[PDB]
Amino acid sequence: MDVFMKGLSKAK
């Protein structure tokens, strides 16, 4: 997924 990091992809 992409929500853990504050900057990676943000797909949530």
Curated annotation (Swiss-Prot):
It comes from the Eukaryota. The modification N-acetylmethionine is found at M1. Highly expressed in presynaptic terminals in the central nervous system. Expressed principally in brain. Phosphorylated, predominantly on serine residues. Phosphorylation by CK1 appears to occur on residues distinct from the residue phosphorylated by other kinases. Cu cation binds at D2. It is found in: Cytoplasm; Membrane; Nucleus; Synapse. Changing D2A: Impairs copper-binding. Neuronal protein that plays several roles in synaptic activity such as regulation of synaptic vesicle trafficking and subsequent neurotransmitter release. Participates as a monomer in synaptic vesicle exocytosis by enhancing vesicle priming, fusion and dilation of exocytotic fusion pores. Mechanistically, acts by increasing local Ca(2+) release from microdomains which is essential for the enhancement of ATP-induced exocytosis. Soluble monomer. Homotetramer. A dynamic intracellular population of tetramers and monomers coexists normally and the tetramer plays an essential role in maintaining homeostasis. Interacts with UCHL1. Interacts with phospholipase D and histones. Interacts (via N-terminus) with synphilin-1/SNCAIP; this interaction promotes formation of SNCA inclusions in the cytoplasm. Interacts with CALM1. Interacts with STXBP1; this interaction controls SNCA self-replicating aggregation. Interacts with SNARE components VAMP2 and SNAP25; these interactions allows SNARE complex assembly and integrity. Belongs to the synuclein family. The 'non A-beta component of Alzheimer disease amyloid plaque' domain (NAC domain) is involved in fibrils formation. The middle hydrophobic region forms the core of the filaments. The C-terminus may regulate aggregation and determine the diameter of the filaments. It is linked to Genetic alterations of SNCA resulting in aberrant polymerization into fibrils, are associated with several neurodegenerative diseases (synucleinopathies). SNCA fibrillar aggregates represent the major non A-beta component of Alzheimer disease amyloid plaque, and a major component of Lewy body inclusions. They are also found within Lewy body (LB)-like intraneuronal inclusions, glial inclusions and axonal spheroids in neurodegeneration with brain iron accumulation type 1. Parkinson disease 1, autosomal dominant: A complex neurodegenerative disorder characterized by bradykinesia, resting tremor, muscular rigidity and postural instability. Additional features are characteristic postural abnormalities, dysautonomia, dystonic cramps, and dementia. The pathology of Parkinson disease involves the loss of dopaminergic neurons in the substantia nigra and the presence of Lewy bodies (intraneuronal accumulations of aggregated proteins), in surviving neurons in various areas of the brain. This is Alpha-synuclein.
